[PDB]
Amino acid sequence: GNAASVKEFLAKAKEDFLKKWETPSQNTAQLDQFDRIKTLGTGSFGRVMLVKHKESGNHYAMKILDKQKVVKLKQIEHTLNEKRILQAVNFPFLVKLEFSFKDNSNLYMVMEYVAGGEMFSHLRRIGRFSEPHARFYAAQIVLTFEYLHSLDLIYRDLKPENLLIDQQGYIQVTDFGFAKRVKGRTWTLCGTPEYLAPEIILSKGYNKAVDWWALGVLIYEMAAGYPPFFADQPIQIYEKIVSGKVRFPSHFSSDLKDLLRNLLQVDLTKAFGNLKNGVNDIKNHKWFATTDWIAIYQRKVEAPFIPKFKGPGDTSNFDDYEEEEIRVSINEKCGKEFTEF
């Protein structure tokens, strides 16, 4: 995202967001304006490829969604949410949507290419992050949720796989697939197993509190090297999540354990982020005592590590994926369903 009182700042941010939310950008590029180079990653819904824009020579990350698959997996409204929200937001730690368009067969979202790779790859390779390292990333997520939640937005898919490291060593949140603008509670069963809050699993109405729960799981995983609740099958994971019992590694500081006990708390009346002081309860927690919040926002804090970059189109920080031809039918598919995309 673009580089840099709180209430005043947020008021202006909401004004900017609403103008774009009410009148979304559309059809800002076309397929033949890019040369597709290689797949950077895939998920349950789309394929993200490194592409080069012909006229500018700039590299981007193009997310390709097969309309028919979107319908099959019942992600029509979710995908429309994804694009409408991403094109309207603006925060230092949110990936920027540069172009969006569609053709007979697919939907396309061209984002800034974040070359540092997924936090996931670095975390699994190194094993675990030191607490200062984990705290550096956590601070960026706390600020990002503060921003998103102020706009009545719930993210719903926080995980190392959806977090990218940029050239400066800072975080860039991607995959707004489950993002939604809602003022009340919502009920959709969505997210990723290890990060689902108890209320989602129990099919209960939930709110922004699930994002803070996810933050707790993310901090735990970053500092421990493994999730607080893991097993071989999702069902087994859900049973552990609902039990709520959490055990901490021997190296976790007392401050970190206290924070996690409050984030992964079953009592919503005591769960940090959803209390009277809201996000301030988190920002003022002892574990974040050394955190200079404004400096983080302004990206003035020294990053734990800067990813190795060889060139503008270097993809060495990403795994290799099997490639597939991107075909476009001569017949338009799901035209009316995605009219607003």
Binding site: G43, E118, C190, D232
Partner: peptide, 18 residues
Amino acid sequence: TTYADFIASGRTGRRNAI
């Protein structure tokens, strides 16, 4: 150890959405 149990589990690779 918990770490050993995790590494021996079937979910140490990238996790896609439900």
